[PDB]
Design an enzyme around this catalytic site. Structure first.
Site, PDB file in Angstrom:
ATOM      1  N   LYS B  40       0.840  -1.190   0.000  1.00 49.76           N
ATOM      2  CA  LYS B  40       0.000   0.000   0.000  1.00 49.76           C
ATOM      3  C   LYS B  40       0.881   1.247   0.000  1.00 49.76           C
ATOM      4  O   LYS B  40       1.818   1.359   0.796  1.00 49.76           O
ATOM      5  CB  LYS B  40      -0.956  -0.020   1.195  1.00 49.76           C
ATOM      6  N   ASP B 128       5.571  -8.073   8.027  1.00 54.83           N
ATOM      7  CA  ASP B 128       4.759  -9.180   8.523  1.00 54.83           C
ATOM      8  C   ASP B 128       5.365 -10.518   8.120  1.00 54.83           C
ATOM      9  O   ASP B 128       5.484 -11.439   8.936  1.00 54.83           O
ATOM     10  CB  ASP B 128       3.327  -9.055   7.997  1.00 54.83           C
TER      11      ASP B 128
HETATM   12  N1  LIG Z   1       4.776   8.615  16.900  1.00 50.59           N
HETATM   13  C1  LIG Z   1       3.435   8.453  16.815  1.00 50.59           C
HETATM   14  N2  LIG Z   1       2.609   8.992  17.735  1.00 50.59           N
HETATM   15  C2  LIG Z   1       1.277   8.836  17.660  1.00 50.59           C
HETATM   16  N3  LIG Z   1       0.652   8.148  16.687  1.00 50.59           N
HETATM   17  C3  LIG Z   1       1.358   7.555  15.695  1.00 50.59           C
HETATM   18  C4  LIG Z   1       2.823   7.679  15.709  1.00 50.59           C
HETATM   19  N4  LIG Z   1       3.276   7.009  14.635  1.00 50.59           N
HETATM   20  C5  LIG Z   1       2.196   6.498  13.991  1.00 50.59           C
HETATM   21  N5  LIG Z   1       1.055   6.822  14.620  1.00 50.59           N
HETATM   22  C6  LIG Z   1      -0.301   6.419  14.175  1.00 50.59           C
HETATM   23  O1  LIG Z   1      -0.292   5.016  13.898  1.00 50.59           O
HETATM   24  C7  LIG Z   1      -0.950   4.726  12.662  1.00 50.59           C
HETATM   25  C8  LIG Z   1      -0.099   3.794  11.802  1.00 50.59           C
HETATM   26  O2  LIG Z   1       0.425   4.563  10.721  1.00 50.59           O
HETATM   27  P1  LIG Z   1       1.158   3.937   9.431  1.00 50.59           P
HETATM   28  O3  LIG Z   1       2.647   4.147   9.552  1.00 50.59           O
HETATM   29  O4  LIG Z   1       0.439   4.470   8.218  1.00 50.59           O
HETATM   30  O5  LIG Z   1       0.878   2.352   9.488  1.00 50.59           O
HETATM   31  P2  LIG Z   1       2.051   1.303   9.131  1.00 50.59           P
HETATM   32  O6  LIG Z   1       2.967   1.326  10.327  1.00 50.59           O
HETATM   33  O7  LIG Z   1       1.325  -0.002   8.923  1.00 50.59           O
HETATM   34  O8  LIG Z   1       2.667   1.863   7.873  1.00 50.59           O
HETATM   35  C9  LIG Z   1      -1.198   6.051  11.959  1.00 50.59           C
HETATM   36  O9  LIG Z   1      -2.599   6.237  11.748  1.00 50.59           O
HETATM   37  C10 LIG Z   1      -0.662   7.129  12.880  1.00 50.59           C
HETATM   38  O10 LIG Z   1      -1.664   8.122  13.108  1.00 50.59           O
HETATM   39 MG   LIG Z   2       1.690   2.649   5.967  1.00 47.33          MG
END
Ligand SMILES: Nc1ncnc2c1ncn2[C@@H]1O[C@H](COP(=O)(O)OP(=O)(O)O)[C@@H](O)[C@H]1O
Ligand SMILES: [Mg+2]
Ligand SMILES: Nc1ncnc2c1ncn2[C@@H]1O[C@H](COP(=O)(O)OP(=O)(O)O)[C@@H](O)[C@H]1O
Ligand SMILES: Nc1ncnc2c1ncn2[C@@H]1O[C@H](COP(=O)(O)OP(=O)(O)O)[C@@H](O)[C@H]1O
Ligand SMILES: Nc1ncnc2c1ncn2[C@@H]1O[C@H](COP(=O)(O)OP(=O)(O)O)[C@@H](O)[C@H]1O
Ligand code: ICS
Ligand code: CLF
Ligand code: SF4
Ligand code: SF4
Ligand code: FES
Ligand code: FES
Ligand SMILES: [Mg+2]
Ligand SMILES: [Mg+2]
Ligand SMILES: [Mg+2]
Lengths: 391, 274, 121, 283, 121, 280, 272, 98
Positions: B40, B128
Site C-alpha cells: 500500500k 509481517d
Molecule cells: N509517533 C506516533 N505517535 C502517535 N501516533 C502515531 C505515531 N506514529 C504512527 N502513529 C499512528 O499510527 C498509525 C499507523 O500509521 P502507518 O505508519 O500508516 O501504518 P504502518 O505502520 O502499517 O505503515 C497512523 O494512523 C498514525 O496516526
Molecule cells: Mg503505511
C-alpha cells in the site's frame, strides 16, 4: 563529416513518431565511431518491429525455406499450409543450380499442401502423409523431402515430426520437418537458426558410421554461399585454382550428399556469418572441424581472404595462391583503370539484411566510392561489432 | 551514502515514523530519499502531500512495460531535498506480492537515482512476512542498516524476532546488520523497559521511544509531517532526537534470535500477556 | 517431444509425450497431465508459472525467441542474469528459467522443475 | 458431509482463539472437526491440545529427511476429540513464507487425512498478505467457505478487502465463496456498526460480534479453550452462538470489493477518522 | 535405457543409449562415450566416482540391491542419509547418490550429475 | 614440441619463484612457454606480469555467466617477451574441493585451443601438500608429461616429495607421466645437498640444480620482477639459466620408487637433521 | 564438554603444541580425548610412546569394513588418562584425502565415545586446505572452539586467513567461533607484536606465545611429552600457561577476512 | 491351474534357451529372437511370453529388452523381459520386486 549534423538529423527525423515509437527507434540509429569494439552500448538490434511502420523485414519462413533450404536442388520442399507463402517465394531468389527441373532438380517449383477450411478445422497430418506418398510416385528421383511449416501449422497444433518419422521409416526416405512458422521470430534470422537446427538434427549426422569417402588433407567446404547469380561458382573456381578440393556447398547448387559429406572435410570456409554460424559452431564442437570467415567482394578483400585461407595449409598451397593472385592481377587492374575515374568520389548508402552491407564496402572502396550509410534489417549485435571497423 | 531500511509489522506507525524521521533529516542540510516498499502506497504522502503517489508498478503496466518508464515520472521531490519513490505491488492473488520491490529497486539502479547527492536512503518495507521482494533489501545487501519498529503487543515482538532471524541468515553473504530498535508507544504500561529488555537480549540497542500523541492526528488532515506542521511540538522534538541518534549510531550487530518460551517469558513477567 | 516434470510436491517425476510447437504452451501440456504449476494470470505478467528448464539432449537445443514480455517478467522476478539476456539477444538461446504459460514446446527432451511457489520466491 | 472452511484476517486480531473456541463448541454438538494451522506462527492448535506447541509438518519433514516418510499418526494429533495439524513455515528470509501451507495440504490429501470422516475442516490462514501458499487454499478450491475476522481498524478492513479481492478472482473456476464477517471487539464504540456497514458494502453479512472478554486470557494461560474452562460463562455462549450460525449459514456470495477512497470515507463516517478537507492541507 | 550425463565441465548435456544389466557398470557406459567421471580405484573403496542420479520416469523405478561395500563408501563421504539407508534396506529403492563404478544400468531414463570432484567434496 | 611440465612441492618452499625464474630463462633462449598457476592462492604470475595477483578464471567465470562466455584473452595474459600466463585460482575456503579451480582452468584452456602449436613448454605450478582432487588431476588426466618436485631439507618437504611420487606410480600405467627430477631449494641448513641427492637415489631419479638462498631474490620480488631480469649479471641469474638448460637437456624420466616412512626417518638421522631415535 | 579444534599449516608445531597442551590439562585432573584428523599419523605419538598408532582407516580396510571395527582397538589411553584416536587418510591420488576424518568422527559418535563424562575433545586438523573432511569440523558444527597455530611467515599467516574465511561461511548455521591465535617462534625478530597485529586485525585475542628451544626435541627421542618428561622446565610451565589461558577463555569473536595487500602491508611494515 | 498343458496352459513345462559355450562367447540375442519364432509356431494358443534371465545373461552382456520390443511389435504379442539374474539380490526377495 558533420557528426553533430547527423545527430541533429536523427533527432528531427524522429519527431513524427509517438512517444513509444520514438523512444524505441532512437535506440536503432547511430553515428559510426570506428574505435568502438562493442556495438550493443552504441546501437540495438534483433528486436521486434514497431507495428504499422512499414518495416522491410520478412518472416522465419522466408529465412528458412527461401534462404537455406530452397537452394538444395535434389530435395523436394513442401510449403505446408495455405498457398500464398509458397506462391510468393517461387523462383523469386536467383540461387543458380545445374539440373533438369521436375526430374532430378526441383528448385524453381512450388510444392504445397494448399490448406482449405477443413484442413484448418480437422488438421493436415493425414493430408501430409498422402502428399508424401503422392510426391514419391510423381517424382521417383527426388533424394529427400523437407516440410517447411507456415503459420497455421503451429497455430492449429499439427504433429509434422511424427509424420516425418513414420513416413521416412516406411519409405526409407529423409524427411526433415522445419517449424519455421512466420510468427516465430522477429525476422528471417530465426528462420536461419531453425533451418540450421533442422539440418543438424535430421541431415548432418547420417554418414557418421561410414568411412567409404576418400578424404584429402586439402578438403574444404563452402558454407553460407547461395550462388546468387553464380557467386559460389566463381568462388569455387578461385578456391580450386588455389589447390584445394571443395567437397560441399551450402547451399547454392547444393546437394543432400554434399551436406552429408561435410563432417569428413578438414576446413569450413563460411562466407556468411549470420545465416550459417550455428552449424559451423556445431561442426567445430562435434567433429573438430575449424571454420573461418572470408570475403570475396572486390580484389582487395579477395586477395586478403585468399592469403588467409592459404595460411591454413602447407607451403604448396601458398605458392599456388601467389600464382592465382599473379594470374588474376592484370584483369582487375584493367577493370579499375577503366571504371575508377568514372566512379571516383561518389557517395553510396546501403540497406541489406545481414553481412552484405559490410561485405560490399571494400568493393566500393576499390573504385574510389565511399559508403555514407550502412544498414541491416535483421543483423545481430555481433554483425555490428564486425561492421563498425569497416565504416 | 548510507542506506537503511525500516522493518516492522503493519500498523505500528512505521510509515509515519520514517516520514517524520526524513523530515527531521531534511532540515539539517541532508538530502535523503524514501523508497516505499510497502504494498500500500501510503509511505510518502506526508512528504509529497499528494493524495496517492503513482507507483512504479502502476505506471509500468499502463505505459506498456518498465522500459518505457522515465525516472522523472516516478521520482517526485515534493520537498526539495526529499526524493520519494513508491514501488507498489500486484493485485492480491496474482503472483508474488513482493515482486513490486524487485522491479523498483532494480529500476532505480538502472537509471542511477543513487548518484552524488544522497546522504541517506530509507526503505519502508513490509515486515509481517520476510520473503520474496520484502526480504530483497537484506538478501541483496541493498540496506546495510536495519531498524525495527516494534511495540508492547506480542505480534510486534514476534515480527522483530523474525527479521533478526533473516539478518543472521544473510550476515555472512552481506554487510547488512541490525542497527537498533524503534519502540512506538501505545498508551500501555511498562513498554519502554519491555523493549529495552528485548534489545538487551538480542545483542542490539534501543534507539528511541516515541510516545503516542495527538499532534500527529492534526498532521494527518494536512497530509504533512509533524515537523513541518508544528516544529515546536513535543513529538516534533522527539523525532529530532530519534533522527540525531540515527546519524550518530555506530554499533551494528549480528542479531541473536529469541525462542518461543524466552519471548513468552518476557511478556508474562511484565504482565502484557497473562 | 519428451517432457519430464519434477517438483518436491510430486512423489514421482512424471514423463509425458507432447506435440512440439503447439499454440497451447508448456502450461497446456502440464494442465492436460495434471501437473500443478501455479497459473495465476491470463496476460502473462504475474510470473507465477516460473519453471527451471534443462535441455537433456544438449546437442538438440533449438533456437527460439524470448519475447519482450517474458524477458521483463523474468527481470521483475529476478530469474534472468545479464549473461543469459545477452545470450538470448545475440544467439537466440533460451534462458535457464522460463514462464510455462509463455513457453513453446520444441522437439527435444526437457526436464521441467518447479517448487509450487510463484516466481519471486 | 464435509464443510471445508477457512478463517482469514490480519495478524494478531484473534483468528486462532476464535477458531479454536468455535471448533471446540462444534465438538459439543457431536461434530468431528479438524484444525489445520496455515500460519507460520504455528500456535493455532495450542488451546486444543493443551501443549506448548504442536510439531509442524516442516519440522518432522526436515528432521526425518522428506515428507514421504512422515507418518499420518505423528502429524495428526487428537485433542478434545478434534484432529489438529500445523503447516508451519520455512526459515524467515528464504523461500516463500506460505510454503508450509502448500506442503501440508498436499501431504494431507495424499495420506488420507482429508477423507470424509469429519463433518468440518478449518484452515487458520494468515491474511496479512495474499500470495502463493496463503492464497493457495482459495486457488486450489480447498476451502469453499471463507470467514474473515475483522476489527474496527484501518488495517483490519484493508486486509478484509484484499481477501475478498482474492475470492472474486477465483470465483469463476471454483466454488470458493465468502461466508461472512467476524467482528472481534477492539474496545471501539462504533466498530460493531462499522463492520455491519463494511459487510453491506462487500455484499456479505456480519456473522457475529465477539466482545473483548478478559476470561479469554485466563483460559489462554491454561492453554485451554474458553468453553471448556468456563462452560457457564457468557463468553462460551457467544462462541456457541457463533458456532450455530456458522453451521446455519447459507449466504455464500461473491463479494464486491471496494476501493481505497470508499474505505476512507467509510472510516470518516463513523468518527474513527476525522473529516478531511482540501483547503487545510498547507500549514 | 537412456542416460543423460550432466556436469559443469561438460558444455552440453550428453544423451546416450545403454544396455541394461551389463556387468560393466555405469562407469563402462561413461567411458565408451567419453564422459570424464573421475575413476581413481579398482576395488570400489574410494569415493571418487560419486554421482547424483535422478529417475526421470518416476513410475518406472526398478528395485535394486544396495551392496554393503557401496553403502559404507557412501557413508564415508557423507552422502547417505539415514532415511535413504532405511529405504534401501526395507524397500530396496536406490539412494539419490551412487558410485558410478558400482552402479548397474536399469531399463529406465536417468539423469546423471557429477561435478568433476571426488566424493567427499 | 609441446613439452608439458609440472612443478610440485610443499607450500611455501619456493615453487613460484623457481618456476617464474626458470621460465624467464627459457624465454631468454627464444622458447615460447606458458605458465598455468594451479596454486589456490594464485601468485605464480606476479613476477612475469609485474602488475599484481593476476585475475583468476574462477573470478572471471563468476562475474560473467559461465566459463564458455569468458574470453581467452581475459585470463591468458602475455608478459616478459610474451610468455603466456593463466591463473586457475580456487573456490571459497570450506566450499567444494580446493582444487576445483585446476579442473575448471585446464578444461577452459583445452576447449578454447590455447594449447597452440608454436608453444615449446607449458609449466603448471600446483600446491603439492595434498595430492588428491584437482591437484592430482594433471597427473591422472595425463596433462603433465614430466614432474619436478621442489624439496628442501625439512621433514615435511621430504614427506611431500614421497607423496607426489606415490601419485605418479599409481597413474604410471595409464599415462606418460614420469618423474623428471628434484630441485633442492636451500634454507642454508647444513648437509642438505647430499640429503636430497640421497633421497633422489632412493627414489630412483636424478637431482636437478640445487638453488642456494640469497637476499637478491627478495630484492627483485619487492619490485615484482624475476631475479634474472632484475640482474642478468648476477650469479643467481646464471644459476637459474643453468637449471633451465638441464631441464631442456633432461632425458631421464623414470617411474619412482616411493620409500617407507621409517626409511625417511632412518635416512634423516644419517645426516644429522633428525637426532637418532631410541624407543626406550 | 567443550569441543575444540587445532588448525594450522603443516609443519608449524601443530602436533607437539597440542600434545603438550593436553598433557598439562590432564595434570589438572581433567579428562581429555585427542582425535588426530591429520593424514600424517604422528599426532598422538608423544602421549602414547609408540612408533605409529594404527589409524582407523588402516584398521577398517584390513578387517573388512568399518562395521567390524571395535572401539577398544581404536581408542587407546595414554599418560594422564587421555583418550587417543588416530584417523589416517587414503593413499595419494585415491579419492578425497579427507575421508578419514568423516569416517572416524561418525564412528566415534556411533559407538558413543564422547558421552563418557569427557571434559575436553581436541581435533588436530590439517590446515593447508579447508575442504572435504578437513573442513568437516567447521561444516558439521563438530568443534565449537577453534585455535589457529601460526608463525610470522606468509604461508602461516595466509593459512590463518583462510581458516577464518571458513568460519565466516558457516557462522550462521552453528556456533563455530575463532578462539585465538596460538603463535610459535621460529626465532625471528619482532614476531610477538607481528602476530598480535594480525590478531587485533581479526578482532580475536592471541592466546599465548610459544618460543622455540631444544627441550621439546630431547623429549621427541623419548616419545614422551615435555610436561611429563620434566615438569620443572621453562617451556613445561609455558604450556601450563597456555593450557590455563585456554580453559579460562571467555571471549569468542567471528573473524573478518584480510585481503592480500592488507596482509602484505602487515608483513612488510615489520621489516620482513 | 485348470488348463490343457501344452495347448493353452504351460505351467509344468520347461522352456529354456539351453546356452552353450558358443552362446556365451558370441552374443546370445540372435538365439533368443529365433526361439521366440519357434514358440509362436509350435504353441500358437499362448497369450504372451516372458523371458526369465539366468546368471550368464547379465554377465556376458545381452539386450533382452530390445528383442522383446522388436519381436513384440512384429508378432503383435506381449514379450516381458525380466532381469532376474540369480546374483542380483541376496535372496528370493528381490526376485519378487523385479
Ligand atoms: N509517533 C506516533 N505517535 C502517535 N501516533 C502515531 C505515531 N506514529 C504512527 N502513529 C499512528 O499510527 C498509525 C499507523 O500509521 P502507518 O505508519 O500508516 O501504518 P504502518 O505502520 O502499517 O505503515 C497512523 O494512523 C498514525 O496516526
Ligand atoms: Mg503505511
Ligand atoms: N475473544 C477475545 N477476547 C479478548 N482477547 C482476545 C480474544 N481473542 C484473542 N484475544 C487476545 O488477542 C491476542 C492475539 O490473538 P491471536 O488469536 O493470537 O491472534 P491471531 O489471529 O494472530 O492468531 C491474544 O494474546 C489473545 O489474548
Ligand atoms: N631462490 C630463493 N632465494 C631466496 N628466497 C626465496 C627463493 N625462492 C623463494 N624465496 C622466498 O620464499 C618465499 C616463499 O616462496 P614462494 O615461491 O611463495 O613459495 P611457493 O612455492 O609456496 O609459491 C618468498 O617470499 C620468497 O621471498
Ligand atoms: N615448541 C617447540 N619448540 C621447538 N621446536 C618445536 C616446537 N614445537 C614443534 N617443534 C618442531 O617443529 C616440528 C613440527 O612438527 P609436528 O608438530 O610434529 O607436526 P605438525 O606438522 O603437525 O606441526 C617438529 O619436528 C618439532 O621438532
Ligand atoms: S543468406 Fe541472408 S536479405 Fe546471408 S536472408 Fe537474405 S543471399 Fe541478404 S544480406 Mo536477400 S543474411 Fe544471403 C541474404 Fe544476406 S536473401 Fe540474401 S541478399 S548473405
Ligand atoms: S508470416 Fe511467413 S510468409 Fe506470412 S502467412 Fe506466415 S509463414 Fe507465410 Fe502465405 S498464406 Fe497468405 S502470405 Fe501470409 S496470409 Fe496466410
Ligand atoms: S514469498 Fe512472501 S510475498 Fe511472495 S508469494 Fe510467498 S508469501 Fe507472498
Ligand atoms: S579431494 Fe583433496 S582438495 Fe578436494 S576437497 Fe578433498 S582434500 Fe580438499
Ligand atoms: S501464469 Fe502468470 S505469468 Fe504465466
Ligand atoms: S572409482 Fe573408486 S569407488 Fe568408483
Ligand atoms: Mg495465530
Ligand atoms: Mg606459490
Ligand atoms: Mg604432525
Amino acid at each position: 563529416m558533420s557528426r553533430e549534423e547527423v545527430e541533429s538529423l536523427i533527432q528531427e527525423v524522429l519527431e513524427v513518431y509517438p512517444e513509444k515509437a520514438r523512444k524505441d527507434r532512437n535506440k536503432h540509429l547511430a553515428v559510426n565511431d570506428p574505435a568502438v569494439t562493442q556495438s550493443k552500448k552504441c546501437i540495438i538490434s534483433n528486436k521486434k518491429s514497431q507495428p504499422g511502420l512499414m518495416t522491410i523485414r520478412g518472416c522465419a519462413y522466408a529465412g528458412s525455406k527461401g534462404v537455406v533450404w530452397g537452394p538444395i536442388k535434389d530435395m523436394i520442399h513442401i510449403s505446408h499450409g495455405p498457398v500464398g507463402c509458397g506462391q510468393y517465394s517461387r523462383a523469386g531468389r536467383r540461387n543458380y543450380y545445374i539440373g533438369t527441373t521436375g526430374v532430378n532438380a526441383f528448385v524453381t517449383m512450388n510444392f504445397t499442401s494448399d490448406f482449405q477450411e477443413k484442413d484448418i478445422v480437422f488438421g493436415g497430418d493425414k493430408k501430409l502423409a498422402k502428399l508424401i506418398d503422392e510426391v514419391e510416385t510423381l517424382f521417383p528421383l527426388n533424394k529427400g523431402i523437407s516440410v517447411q511449416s507456415e503459420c497455421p501449422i503451429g497455430l492449429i497444433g499439427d504433429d509434422i515430426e511424427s509424420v516425418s518419422k513414420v513416413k521416412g521409416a516406411e519409405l526409407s526416405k529423409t524427411i526433415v520437418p522445419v517449424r519455421c512458422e512466420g510468427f516465430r521470430g522477429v525476422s528471417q534470422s530465426l528462420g536461419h537458426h531453425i533451418a540450421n537446427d533442422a539440418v543438424r538434427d535430421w541431415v548432418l549426422g547420417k554418414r557418421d558410421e561410414d568411412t567409404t569417402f576418400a578424404s584429402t588433407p586439402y578438403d574444404v567446404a563452402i558454407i553460407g554461399d547461395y550462388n546468387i547469380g553464380g557467386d559460389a561458382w566463381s568462388s569455387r573456381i578461385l578456391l580450386e585454382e588455389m589447390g584445394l578440393r571443395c567437397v560441399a556447398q551450402w547451399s547454392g547448387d547444393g546437394s543432400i550428399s554434399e551436406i552429408e559429406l561435410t563432417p569428413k572435410v578438414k576446413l569450413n570456409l563460411v562466407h556468411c556469418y549470420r545465416s550459417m554460424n550455428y552449424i559451423s559452431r556445431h561442426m567445430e564442437e562435434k567433429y573438430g572441424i575449424p571454420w573461418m570467415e572470408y570475403n570475396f567482394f572486390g580484389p582487395t578483400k579477395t586477395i586478403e581472404s585468399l592469403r588467409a585461407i592459404a595460411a591454413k595449409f602447407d607451403e604448396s598451397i601458398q605458392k599456388k595462391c601467389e600464382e592465382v593472385i599473379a594470374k588474376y592481377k592484370p584483369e582487375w587492374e584493367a577493370v579499375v583503370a577503366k571504371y575508377r575515374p568514372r566512379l571516383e568520389g561518389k557517395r553510396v548508402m546501403l540497406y541489406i539484411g545481414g553481412l552484405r552491407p559490410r561485405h560490399v564496402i571494400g568493393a566500393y572502396e576499390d573504385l574510389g566510392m565511399e559508403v555514407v550509410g550502412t544498414g541491416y534489417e535483421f543483423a545481430h549485435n555481433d554483425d555490428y561489432d564486425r561492421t563498425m571497423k569497416e565504416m | 551514502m548510507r542506506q537503511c531500511a525500516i522493518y516492522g509489522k503493519g500498523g505500528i506507525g512505521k510509515s509515519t515514523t520514517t516520514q517524520n524521521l526524513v523530515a527531521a533529516l531534511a532540515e539539517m542540510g541532508k538530502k535523503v530519499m524514501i523508497v516505499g516498499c510497502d504494498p500500500k502506497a501510503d509511505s510518502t504522502r506526508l512528504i509529497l502531500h499528494s493524495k496517492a503517489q503513482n507507483t512504479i508498478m502502476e505506471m509500468a503496466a499502463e505505459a506498456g512495460t518498465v522500459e518505457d518508464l522515465e525516472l522523472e515520472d516516478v521520482l517526485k521531490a515534493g520537498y526539495g531535498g526529499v526524493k520519494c519513490v513508491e514501488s507498489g505491488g500486484p493485485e492480491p492473488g496474482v503472483g508474488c506480492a513482493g515482486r513490486g520491490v524487485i522491479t523498483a529497486i532494480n529500476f532505480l539502479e538502472e537509471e542511477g537515482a543513487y548518484e552524488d547527492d544522497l546522504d541517506f536512503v530509507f526503505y519502508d518495507v513490509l515486515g509481517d512476512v520476510v520473503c520474496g521482494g520484502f526480504a530483497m533489501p537484506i538478501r541483496e545487501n541493498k540496506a546495510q542498516e536495519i531498524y525495527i519498529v516494534c511495540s508492547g503487543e506480542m505480534m510486534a515482538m514476534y515480527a522483530a524476532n523474525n527479521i533478526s532471524k533473516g539478518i543472521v541468515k544473510y550476515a555472512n553473504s552481506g554487510s547488512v546488520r541490525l542497527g537498533g530498535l524503534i519502540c512506538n508507544s501505545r498508551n500501555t504500561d511498562r513498554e519502554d523497559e519491555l523493549i529495552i529488555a528485548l534489545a538487551n537480549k538480542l545483542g542490539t540497542q534501543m534507539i528511541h521511544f516515541v510516545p503516542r500523541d495527538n499532534v500527529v492526528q492534526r498532521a494527518e488532515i494536512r497530509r504533512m509531517t509533524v515537523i513541518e506542521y508544528d516544529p515546536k511540538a513535543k513529538q516534533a522534538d522527539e523525532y529530532r532526537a530519534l533522527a540525531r541518534k540515527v546519524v550518530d549510531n555506530k554499533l551494528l550487530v549480528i542479531p541473536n534470535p529469541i525462542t518461543m518460551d524466552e519471548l513468552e517469558e518476557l511478556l508474562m513477567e511484565f504482565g502484557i500477556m497473562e | 517431444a519428451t517432457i519430464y516434470f519434477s517438483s518436491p510436491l510430486m512423489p514421482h517425476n512424471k514423463k509425458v509425450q507432447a506435440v512440439a510447437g503447439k499454440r497451447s504452451t508448456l502450461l497446456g501440456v502440464a494442465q492436460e497431465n495434471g501437473v500443478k504449476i501455479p497459473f495465476e494470470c491470463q496476460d502473462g505478467n504475474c510470473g507465477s508459472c516460473l519453471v527451471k528448464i534443462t535441455h537433456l539432449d544438449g546437442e538438440r537445443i533449438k533456437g527460439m525467441l524470448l519475447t519482450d514480455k517474458e524477458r521483463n517478467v523474468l527481470k521483475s522476478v529476478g530469474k534472468l542474469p545479464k549473461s543469459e539476456e545477452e545470450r538470448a539477444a545475440v544467439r537466440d538461446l533460451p534462458p535457464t528459467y522460463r514462464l510455462a504459460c509463455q513457453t513453446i514446446v520444441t522437439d527435444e527432451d526437457l526436464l521441467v522443475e518447479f517448487t509450487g511457489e510463484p516466481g519471486g520466491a
